[PDB]
Amino acid sequence: DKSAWCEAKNITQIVGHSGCEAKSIQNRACLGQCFSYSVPNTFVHCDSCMPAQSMWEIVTLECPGVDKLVEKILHCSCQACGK
Amino acid sequence: DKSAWCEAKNITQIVGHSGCEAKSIQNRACLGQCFSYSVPESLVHCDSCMPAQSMWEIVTLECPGHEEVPRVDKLVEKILHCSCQACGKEPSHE
Numbered sequence: 001d002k003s004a005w006c007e008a009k010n011i012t013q014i015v016g017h018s019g020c021e022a023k024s025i026q027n028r029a030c031l032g033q034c035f036s037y038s039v040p041n042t043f044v045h046c047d048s049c050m051p052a053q054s055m056w057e058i059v060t061l062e063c064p065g066v067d068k069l070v071e072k073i074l075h076c077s078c079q080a081c082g083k
Numbered sequence: 084d085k086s087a088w089c090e091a092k093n094i095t096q097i098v099g100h101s102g103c104e105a106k107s108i109q110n111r112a113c114l115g116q117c118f119s120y121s122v123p124e125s126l127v128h129c130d131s132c133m134p135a136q137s138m139w140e141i142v143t144l145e146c147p148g149h150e151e152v153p154r155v156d157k158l159v160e161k162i163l164h165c166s167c168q169a170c171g172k173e174p175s176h177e
């Protein structure tokens with residue numbers, strides 16, 4: 001047997017990067033191994049590990065002491081590679 | 084075990100057409116678990132197990148049915164090799 005796994009991995013991202021001072025925040029990244037298969041015909045399925053739940057959060061930078069929008073990934077799951 | 088794998092599996096498919104005699108051929112199907120990952124949208128990395136090399140082959144069926152159109156041709160895709168590749172890339176591989 002082989003199982004499909006998709007997980008939200010803890011990361012630190014650094015927003016940067018304009019003429020202001022960068023900040024580090026805690027986030028998640030999706031990482032996984034979903035099933036895909038391709039069966040031939042005569043004249044097909046793709047899943048990938050992507051955000052299942054996320055939210056937008058504002059991060060304010062000091063210059064040197066602007067706002068930046070960041071995506072907070074909460075959960076991940078195997079979904080159709082379509083969109 | 085924590086590795087991405089893409090398997091070209093031997094199959095037998097059956098090619099047919101009404102009023103004709105079916106044929107079985109040997110083909111391969113791709114099956115796998117490629118890595119995908121997403122960072123916070125911008126850098127999406129999507130791989131899937133898809134044909135790396137394929138070809139079109141004609142298969143002729145006999146239709147002992149009929150004197151005009153005693154036989155018929157069908158086009159089939161032969162999958163030769165499979166591999167983890169960037170998603171959305173077209174299956175057909177030549």
Ligand SMILES: *[C@@H]1O[C@H](CO)[C@@H](O)[C@H](O)[C@H]1NC(C)=O
Pocket residue numbers: 010026
């Ligand atoms: C990962 O970070 C999240 C912050 O949302 C925290 O709740 C969780 O305890 C952490 N777990 C691990 C394994 O890093």
Ligand SMILES: *[C@@H]1O[C@H](CO)[C@@H](O)[C@H](O)[C@H]1NC(C)=O
Pocket residue numbers: 093109110111163
């Ligand atoms: C499976 O059939 C394919 C036909 O493309 C052939 O290349 C391969 O040698 C065969 N392998 C086995 C184990 O029968």
